[model samples]
Target: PLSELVERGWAAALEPVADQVAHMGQFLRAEIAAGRRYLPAGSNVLRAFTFPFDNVRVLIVGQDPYPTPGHAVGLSFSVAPDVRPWPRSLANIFDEYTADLGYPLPSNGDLTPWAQRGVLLLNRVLTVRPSNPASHRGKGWEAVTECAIRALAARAAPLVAILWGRDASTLKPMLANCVAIESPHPSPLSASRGFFGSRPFSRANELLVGMGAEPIDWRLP
Candidate 1:
């Protein structure tokens, strides 16, 4: 269970979601005692909130972490810096990114830079079991995540949410003031269908600029 939301520097601003975070921490401990394990590490579970709340300008939502061991690292759709070949979904994301921005893809999948520049790459469900996806659904992460969603949605500052999958895209209506971008999930199975040519990267930057916010430098390298 995480007791460091205040230490994370964003909880004070998200007071409405305070109770949910406390419940989420207890759920993690119960899951651990039930012979279940979560991916990533305890230290990184709240990595998205490592910076100040006001610094967040972009929100990218994922269903959950990669089920593979050593691959999930708290951020949505991002793997460890050294995870070669990348995951198919993240690879698809890179492919669409280059197509959207007309730029070269980076050499690795570490998305820390985007986060540093104020992108909240959050997994809706913060925990996943190795070799099993969706293993922790209904275990209190949703309450926490939804509150996070609402926090951003209710913000008066310029914000954009790039909701990629159907589950994630359903959140478009909740993003009251953000420039919402919706497309199919960026998996190899679906990218060609709708995720491709969506130009979310360029579009998000354009919309942010329209709202008096600085455009994000989408280049990872």
Candidate 2:
């Protein structure tokens, strides 16, 4: 659960993003209202991710927002509902991770259990980038993101954080007392080059379990 102080900071830090999201939503709603082709961008709908409050043991942190639509709904790394087809990376990683856990991937798996079980799937950037020329480049987002991660750690204690890429690894020092495991990102670009295997989620989970935490029951649906 987000502490009041953490929530306050997140709210303040995210105000500008919320305003931008609202504007995008209003514009898209008007288009939908008028039966026009709707191109939803940084709407609040993308900001719809949640942080589970209890029995949280693992945290997965990613680099930034997915390029796919609706995925950035602030609920943390969720694919957008309206995206005609999802990205291969998203499908690939989910399959790979689940397979690593010894489960056959379901044709259509529900991710809510993972989210509810305190698996916080977050990106460094909380909101989707505005579709602007300057914003198209990753600019001026890292520093504030570190603050947000710190805030999240402060609120979500007793957590084992999995930093999944260089950017996330860079933030490892910021989280005190929490087990921060760094891995080569699970992206196809890195998967074969010993990145994924080097820090497999299972091995990471083992480290957590070794620390006296309950062994991860990956069989749980």
Top candidate when judged by TM-score against the true structure: 1
RMSD of each: 2.3, 6.1
Q: In model 2, how large is the Cα lDDT of residue 150? A: 64
Report model 1's TM-score to 2 decimal places: 0.90
Best by lDDT: 1
Question: What is candidate 1's CA lDDT for residue 118?
Answer: 86
lDDT by residue (tens digit), candidate 1, 1-221: 23354434367555677777777777778878988888878777887777566778888888888899999988888888889988888988899888888889888999999988888898888888889988888877877777778776666788887775457545766675445554444533377787778777788888898888999988897
Q: Rate the local accuracy (lDDT) of all candidates.
A: 0.77, 0.50
lDDT of 2 at 193: 55
Model 2 scores worst on lDDT over the 10 consecutive residues at 128-137
> Which pairs of residues have clashing backbones in candidate 2?
46-72, 46-73, 46-74, 47-73, 47-74, 48-73, 49-74, 49-75, 70-80, 71-80
Candidate 2 wrongly placed segments (more than 4 Å): 1-49, 53-55, 75-77, 80-85, 129-144, 152-156, 184-188, 195-199, 215-221
